[PDB]
Amino acid sequence: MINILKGKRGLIMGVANDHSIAWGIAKVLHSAGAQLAFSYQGESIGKRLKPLALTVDSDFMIPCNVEDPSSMDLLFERIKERWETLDFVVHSIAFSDKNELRGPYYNTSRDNFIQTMLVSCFSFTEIVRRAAQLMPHGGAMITLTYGGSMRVVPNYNAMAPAKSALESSTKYLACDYGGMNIRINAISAGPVRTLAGASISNGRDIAAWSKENSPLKRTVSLEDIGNSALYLLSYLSNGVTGEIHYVDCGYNIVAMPS
Amino acid sequence: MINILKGKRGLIMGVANDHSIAWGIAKVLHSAGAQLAFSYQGESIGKRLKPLALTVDSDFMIPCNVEDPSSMDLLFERIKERWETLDFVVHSIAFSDKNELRGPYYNTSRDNFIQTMLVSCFSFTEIVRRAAQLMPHGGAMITLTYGGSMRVVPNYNAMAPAKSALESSTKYLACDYGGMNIRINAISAGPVRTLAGASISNGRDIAAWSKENSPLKRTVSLEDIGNSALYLLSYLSNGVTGEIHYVDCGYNIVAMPS
Numbered sequence: 001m002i003n004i005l006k007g008k009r010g011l012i013m014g015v016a017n018d019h020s021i022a023w024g025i026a027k028v029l030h031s032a033g034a035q036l037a038f039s040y041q042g043e044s045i046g047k048r049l050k051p052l053a054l055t056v057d058s059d060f061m062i063p064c065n066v067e068d069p070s071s072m073d074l075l076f077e078r079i080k081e082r083w084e085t086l087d088f089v090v091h092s093i094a095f096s097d098k099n100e101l102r103g104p105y106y107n108t109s110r111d112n113f114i115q116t117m118l119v120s121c122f123s124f125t126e127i128v129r130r131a132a133q134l135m136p137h138g139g140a141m142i143t144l145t146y147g148g149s150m151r152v153v154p155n156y157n158a159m160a161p162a163k164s165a166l167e168s169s170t171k172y173l174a175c176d177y178g179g180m181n182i183r184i185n186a187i188s189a190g191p192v193r194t195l196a197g198a199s200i201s202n203g204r205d206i207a208a209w210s211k212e213n214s215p216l217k218r219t220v221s222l223e224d225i226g227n228s229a230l231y232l233l234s235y236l237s238n239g240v241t242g243e244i245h246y247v248d249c250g251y252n253i254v255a256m257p258s
Numbered sequence: 259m260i261n262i263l264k265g266k267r268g269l270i271m272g273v274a275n276d277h278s279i280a281w282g283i284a285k286v287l288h289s290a291g292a293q294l295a296f297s298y299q300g301e302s303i304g305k306r307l308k309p310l311a312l313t314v315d316s317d318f319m320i321p322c323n324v325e326d327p328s329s330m331d332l333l334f335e336r337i338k339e340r341w342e343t344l345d346f347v348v349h350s351i352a353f354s355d356k357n358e359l360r361g362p363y364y365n366t367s368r369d370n371f372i373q374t375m376l377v378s379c380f381s382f383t384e385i386v387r388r389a390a391q392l393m394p395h396g397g398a399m400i401t402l403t404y405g406g407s408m409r410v411v412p413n414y415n416a417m418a419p420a421k422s423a424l425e426s427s428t429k430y431l432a433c434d435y436g437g438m439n440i441r442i443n444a445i446s447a448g449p450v451r452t453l454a455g456a457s458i459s460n461g462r463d464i465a466a467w468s469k470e471n472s473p474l475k476r477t478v479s480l481e482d483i484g485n486s487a488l489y490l491l492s493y494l495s496n497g498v499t500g501e502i503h504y505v506d507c508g509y510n511i512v513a514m515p516s
């Protein structure tokens with residue numbers, strides 16, 4: 001009963017399996033009428049994406065290494081050879097050495113910090129500025145963040161300044177592109193069940209904690225995020241740019257457990 | 259007649275001349291009793307620092323390039339050959355390419371971003387880890403930041419996500435080290451007429467705008483920042499850690515001019 005993206009086409013980055021946030025988003029954005037292009041980071045991923053993409057009417061798949069600006073130049077070159085125009089971009093790329101997401105933050109190595117910054121923060125700047133060039137009549141973009149950027153989440157470590165800066169760049173990008181009628185927002189998702197446990201050593205704990213202590217008593221679903229993304233990428237969110245939108249079943253509001 | 263820093267020893271990072279924030283801080287800390295060590299970046303800065311440091315009774319000056327791990331190691335070796343233990347650190351170091359502090363944030367290049375991040379953000383993590391080893395009974399450190407991290411200031415560009423990451427790591431460092439009674443805080447200063455300040459285009463306009471529209475209608479002085487540093491580094495702020503403390507004559511609270 002929703003087709004507000006009828007006739008709109010966009011780019012989805014961040015799919016790694018059927019449990020990826022970018023995938024939940026993809027499903028919901030397609031059900032609302034969007035044509036999807038996808039990027040993929042590796043071969044195993046491409047092989048899982050292929051069937052997934054097919055179930056949302058799409059064979060448009062383009063490998064990309066978000067750490068290499070040439071790769072991204074190429075990603076847009078391949079996109080452009082089918083679409084002269086783009087309406088939205090989903091950026092859900094998060095990487096860090098998972099072995100360094102344990103113990104105290106001060107053990108963050110310089111190279112992991114550089115790499116985590118590059119992939120988890122600056123890639124959005126890169127992509128956004130490439131994509132804008134295909135939005136001559138405006139458009140909308142989102143990145144993904146987590147509340148661990150601003151309050152201390154144990155183990156999160158290197159991810160934390162990276163998101164913090166991602167959130168910062170989100171707001172600067174919004175100001176840059178605002179005159180061109182491009183909107184740039186972020187979704188601060190809560191832990192997603194099962195996904196949490198594979199991303200970081202205490203993921204299960206973080207999630208269980210979040211579900212026990214959120215006002216809504218559940219964790220956010222992939223579909224929740226998909227619908228919030230649908231909101232921020234459609235005309236519905238026309239009065240909204242540069243927003244760090246919290247979609248965590250309200251976990252962020254509670255100061256302590258009951 | 260203050261002397262709450264009687265018998266304390268501290269590291270001052272970031273003096274470049276007699277207008278530097280770290281210098282204002284050094285002056286008020288010294289006048290409250292503290293013995294001071296200084297790190298300087300280059301030879302001209304060193305030549306300018308010798309006479310100054312002399313006026314606060316110090317010849318304890320060590321070179322240090324903060325994008326060089328070896329050099330920060332050497333810095334702390336040179337400290338230890340005189341002091342086995344240390345009471346406080348001031349981290350007042352920033353860098354970004356003058357050329358990129360102009361125009362839209364999206365023109366920020368990858369290399370300037372990595373470098374700005376290393377020097378402006380991660381160098382604090384670097385320094386904090388080494389210094390902590392010199393505070394077996396606890397102590398206090400501060401870094402410097404600016405409200406441009408979280409609200410958009412024209413031309414501030416790459417400095418913004420860098421400061422944001424810096425504010426993030428401050429809180430994370432505060433959690434890693436609170437068990438050791440080491441407090442880690444930051445000062446968010448209003449505009450001050452400095453050497454690195456003149457890298458930003460239209461910083462003059464920025465400072466005039468911030469002065470005109472602040473509740474107090476004045477700019478912060480090196481002494482204001484020095485005094486808030488004295489607070490943040492002594493027994494006075496014993497209940498304060500992880501705090502981003504605004505010392506900007508209240509600019510941040512005003513939503514629009516009157």
Ligand SMILES: NC(=O)c1ccc[n+]([C@@H]2O[C@H](COP(=O)([O-])OP(=O)(O)OC[C@H]3O[C@@H](n4cnc5c(N)ncnc54)[C@H](O)[C@@H]3O)[C@@H](O)[C@H]2O)c1
Binds near residue numbers: 303351377
């Ligand atoms: N200038 C302002 O108005 C202002 C506003 C609030 C916050 N801040 C912050 O204050 C601090 C900057 O000092 P400042 O503004 O008094 O100007 P400044 O230029 O006098 O001092 C900046 C220092 O950063 C140092 N630095 C740069 N690269 C270095 C390296 N590789 N190794 C060691 N040192 C290096 C410089 O040597 C210099 O001493 C920064 O954290 C800055 O972001 C500045």
